[PDB]
Write a protein that binds this DNA or RNA. Structure first.
Lengths: 170, 127, 106, 197, 69
RNA sequence: UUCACUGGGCCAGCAUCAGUUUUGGUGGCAGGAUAAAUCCAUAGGAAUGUAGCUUGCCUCGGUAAGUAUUAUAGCCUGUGGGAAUACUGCCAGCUGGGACUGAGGACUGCGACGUAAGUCAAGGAUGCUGGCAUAAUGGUUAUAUGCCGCCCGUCUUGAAA
RNA sequence: AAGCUCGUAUCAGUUUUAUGAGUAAGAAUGAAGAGCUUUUAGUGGGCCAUUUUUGGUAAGCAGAACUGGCGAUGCGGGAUGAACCGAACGUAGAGUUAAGGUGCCGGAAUACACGCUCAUCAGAACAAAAGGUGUUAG
RNA sequence: AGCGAAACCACAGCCAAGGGAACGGGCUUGGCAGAAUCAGCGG
RNA sequence: GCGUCUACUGAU
RNA sequence: GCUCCACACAGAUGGAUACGAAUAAGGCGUCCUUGUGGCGUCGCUGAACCAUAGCAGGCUAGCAACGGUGCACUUGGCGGAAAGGCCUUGGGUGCUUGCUGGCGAAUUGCAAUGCGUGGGGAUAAAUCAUUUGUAUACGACUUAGA
């Protein structure tokens, strides 16, 4: 499962310059090792400090204050494909940031065939008010007292035979 | 005429640790995932996919985004638990559970009672 | 009176094998009602039996019996590995086999 | 558990039904498919018809009759598809295949016997709503099956000669249902209810 | 199902009680005494005598891994 | 010759043992924002605007526009109170089940229990029992079952031919 | 193969450092089986891939520096195979893997979640610059 | 009617595709079709 | 579409 | 096959347990308003229904019963797709665990599951044989004769 880890950067302090630039950033990854690897990869491109000269000080997890509150997360993404890299922006309705980023990755794999290697997370923020959701398919769920059915339900059974031929009513 | 997902809709969990426990929908996240709360049933507040949960034919009033306390208050006021017992769902579940728990002696008593009932029905037929 | 069957009835699918090589020393048996490996855990260690009508009347009764024991679960479909002191002739693929309740542990 | 299993052709998916039946057939279970003329196949009717005339061009060069045979019967064509799902070249495969019988419609005495369906092979449970599908009825006729008319004609008689039986059974069950309803509430009857019966 | 056993002595049925080398009379008397002692306990629960006299057998569709004992 | 005890070899079941291995139940611990949740209180904000009220209207005197921030529902933000719980890791923790091995051969040693006496799962299976001489059991031969298997040696072979 | 003093720092397809446009370690790691004299059978070949190339034309290509497998190399898998992946080998009992797989022939879940596509033969080394009032998202 | 050889013979044959120099005939995937048995397109 | 040692062609 | 003589012996373990038919709809009852109707209700898997008690399932007595059912006849229809089964009508013949009793289970000792042949008497005919041509290189085939 995905997770959020916070990492900082204080590339080894040269003489008379302790704690340089306090390079703080947030990383989304499953385990700590992957989080550190992605942090190093991002640092190697955002600036010119190499991993050999760098040093990880501390890694702390950041959960969600209200993991039971539905939010319309705004997602800014920079990724690359067979063509040159280009920024992208998307909005996802999810309870938690980790779930939102997981669905973002799944959608990117679905439509854009992208993966963790080619996906870079720019920033994630919550939409504080309605009508700010540009994407129509996300604003759709924000209507007053939205109610819809689920026609043609699917079902599974352990037995390989049935004498009823049940209907898909739902 | 179909069961519609909506705030205050009572649902039954089909799989997972909370299987067989009732829950109420708090807010729909998307077509595939919805938020449910079942504090009376003991299932912790968590999101679940519609595939793992089957919608029951009962409903009760509930404001959107209701917290655990408000959800419990509405559950108590609506007495949806009492409605569930009178529904065929609860009767079928209880019948299935009781049969699996019958011991050998109880099973033999069941057979004897069934034989007596069959004899009485046959006597009370073709009169 | 009406029914005397105490043994659980199952089917012998085939020996453990692979794309090319096959191992006749490990038989796979299907048990009615077993849907998942968890249920198959109860049937492990039970005495397996096979019954077939022979031709020669060795001891008056033409029926002959072969014995075996369950060893472990096999696959998510509830299949269970089986072993016999005398390996089956491989001609019983799809035949019916008897699984006794003993030795009981409940 | 059932010594013989009768699978209703109507609503079934030919590809899924054959695959599941093959494994059960190979395990000593006897299966008798019925209503073979109503099997459904996914895809557009023209699409299904396209991959039926393709193999006429490759039957055989030296002698056309010494090669694949163009079979048009709905019962056998379904069996032919199932034939490729089993090791028919081996002795065990031949014996297992003999267990499977396929007939158009429901010939006797299977008419008076119960039939089952395969939930994991129903076309109505796997095909998305609105998608085109092939009924295999006109397809068989379009490739030379001249018995569709007779099948349709005599299927109605079976349904007519069976609807009244269900009505009679339902009328008979009403007396049993009333007897059970009035027989309830007794001391013996209530004991069964407490014990889950 | 558990019937009372404190009312019937079983200390006599030791390992040496069984031996070989046309029915011994003392064994018959002991069996009769045990049966007559246990009949009093059996008579308490209705249908218990018939339940014991009935041979157990499995029915179609039974699931021993699900049956509760 | 009166007797009483006892008896070779085949493989197995049972109870407990040592090694390997597989899969359950359960208890006690340390960390995260001293988990985040959830719950209670507190000061504020909002509508996908709760009730009340106003404005016109048909299917009825209520239907969509307002004031309106809790009212004849509730939501969110920050703060304080308090526990709980997922995850990770630990227990030289407890307790079952499934499968194979029985290998060494009278004490010399390392260890535990016990006041001592002695005992033990402590450098490899102990004990009870089953079945048998028209035996128990085993081998051979011709088919059958599932799979595998291209005909031998050489020679130029990069090798294959 | 036989004999010697040896047992080690003899050394090492390894690595680092005061010090190059390896020197030394009272260095890191590992093998206790290292040298000297006398000679004993067999050996003058290539193929596949790579770091280099001599340059790219539709296309000839020979010459040639380097490292891995075959050569002499089983076995599992790619259903089918020299150029592929794991793995190199005493006969055996017990359990877990790799490649490769889990609808059937085939021993293994028609597992869970996201959407994508109806192909008039979709899907399981080249024409790839364009067209679609085809579709899913920016 | 009766007598009576020789050449040749590891064994030999129902086909489509893959099988690298392609030899497919014994490797794999599919489809065929009768113990025994005259007679040949101008192969 | 018609214009312009595998195999049996007759057999048991 | 009528008959004599004479010899030989691919996997049963309770029940394949019958309406049509959509899957953006479908059954049961109520209720005639008999219409594309109102009402309650069913599914959400067969985890169901029937059946199942008695030495491999006995002997015997009583009550309720007159119901259930194995057995051959019997009034008859349906079933022609591979018809090959359904019953009802009537008694008779057993049981009835629906209920209440008496007789016995041992030693088997702690499990090793516990219909065709080779020889006749009578009937059926087809090749052999002849003939024939309507067939015909040669097989084969088609006509006719106690």
């Amino acid at each position: 499962h995905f997770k959020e880890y916070q990492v900082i950067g204080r590339r080894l302090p040269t003489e008379s310059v302790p704690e340089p630039k306090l390079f703080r950033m947030r990383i989304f990854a499953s385990n700590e090792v992957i989080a550190k690897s992605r942090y190093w990869y991002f640092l190697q491109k955002l600036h010119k400090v190499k991993k050999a000269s760098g040093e990880i000080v501390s890694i702390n997890q950041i959960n969600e204050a209200h993991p039971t509150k539905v939010k319309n997360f705004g997602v800014w993404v920079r990724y690359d494909s067979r063509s040159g890299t280009h920024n992208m922006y998307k909005e996802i309705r999810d309870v938690s940031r980790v779930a939102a980023v997981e669905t973002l990755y799944q959608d990117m794999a679905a439509r854009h065939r992208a993966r963790f290697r080619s996906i870079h997370i720019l920033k994630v923020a919550e939409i504080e008010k309605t009508a700010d959701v540009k994407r129509q398919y996300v604003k759709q769920f924000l209507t007053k007292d939205l109610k819809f059915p689920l026609p043609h339900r699917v079902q599974k059974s352990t037995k390989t035979f049935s004498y009823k031929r049940p209907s898909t009513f739902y | 005429n179909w069961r519609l997902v909506e705030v205050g809709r009572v649902v039954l969990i089909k799989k997972g640790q909370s299987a067989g426990k009732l829950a109420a929908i708090v807010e729909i996240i998307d077509q595939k995932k919805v938020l449910i709360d079942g504090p009376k049933a003991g299932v912790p507040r968590q999101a679940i996919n519609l595939g793992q949960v089957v919608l029951t034919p009962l409903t009760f009033a509930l404001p959107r985004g209701a917290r655990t306390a408000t959800v419990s208050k509405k559950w108590a006021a609506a007495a949806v638990c009492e409605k569930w017992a009178a529904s065929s769902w609860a009767k079928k579940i209880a019948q299935r559970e009781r049969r699996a728990a019958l011991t050998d002696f109880e099973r033999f008593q069941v057979m004897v009672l069934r034989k007596q009932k069959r004899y009485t029905v046959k006597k009370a037929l073709a009169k | 009176a009406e029914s005397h069957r105490l043994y659980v009835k199952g089917k012998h699918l085939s020996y453990q094998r692979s794309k090319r090589v096959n191992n006749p020393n490990v038989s796979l048996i299907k048990i009615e009602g077993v849907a998942t490996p968890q249920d198959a855990q109860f049937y492990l260690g039970k005495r397996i039996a096979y019954v077939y009508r022979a031709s020669k009347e060795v001891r008056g009764s033409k029926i002959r019996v072969m014995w075996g024991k369950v060893t472990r679960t096999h696959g998510n479909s509830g299949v269970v590995r089986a072993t016999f002191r005398n390996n089956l002739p491989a001609k019983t693929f799809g035949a019916s086999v008897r699984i006794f309740l003993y030795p009981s542990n409940i | 558990v059932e010594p013989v299993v009768v699978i209703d052709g109507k609503g079934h998916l030919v590809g899924r039904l054959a695959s599941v039946v093959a494994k059960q057939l190979l395990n000593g279970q006897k299966i008798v498919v019925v209503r073979a003329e109503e099997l459904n196949i996914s895809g557009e009717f023209f699409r299904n018809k396209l991959k039926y005339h393709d193999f006429l061009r490759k039957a055989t060069a030296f002698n056309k009759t010494r090669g694949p045979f163009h079979f048009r019967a709905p019962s056998r064509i379904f069996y032919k598809a199932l034939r490729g799902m089993v090791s028919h070249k081996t002795a065990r495969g031949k014996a297992a295949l003999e267990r499977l019988k396929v007939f158009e419609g429901i010939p006797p005495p299977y008419d008076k016997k119960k039939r089952v369906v395969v939930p994991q092979a129903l076309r109505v449970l796997r095909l998305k709503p609105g998608r085109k599908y092939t009924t295999l009825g006109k397809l068989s006729t379009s490739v030379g099956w001249k018995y569709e008319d007779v099948v349709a004609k005599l299927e109605a008689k079976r349904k007519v000669s069976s609807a009244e039986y269900y009505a009679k059974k339902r009328a008979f069950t009403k007396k049993v249902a009333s007897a059970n309803a009035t027989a309830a509430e007794s001391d013996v009857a209530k004991q069964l209810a407490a014990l889950g019966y | 199902t558990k019937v009372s056993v404190e009312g019937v002595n079983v200390e006599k049925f030791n390992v040496e009680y069984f031996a070989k080398e046309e029915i011994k009379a003392e064994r018959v008397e002991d069996q009769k005494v045990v049966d007559k002692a246990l009949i009093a306990e059996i008579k308490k629960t209705p249908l218990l005598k018939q339940y014991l006299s009935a041979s157990f057998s499995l029915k179609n569709g039974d699931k021993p891994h699900m049956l509760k004992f």
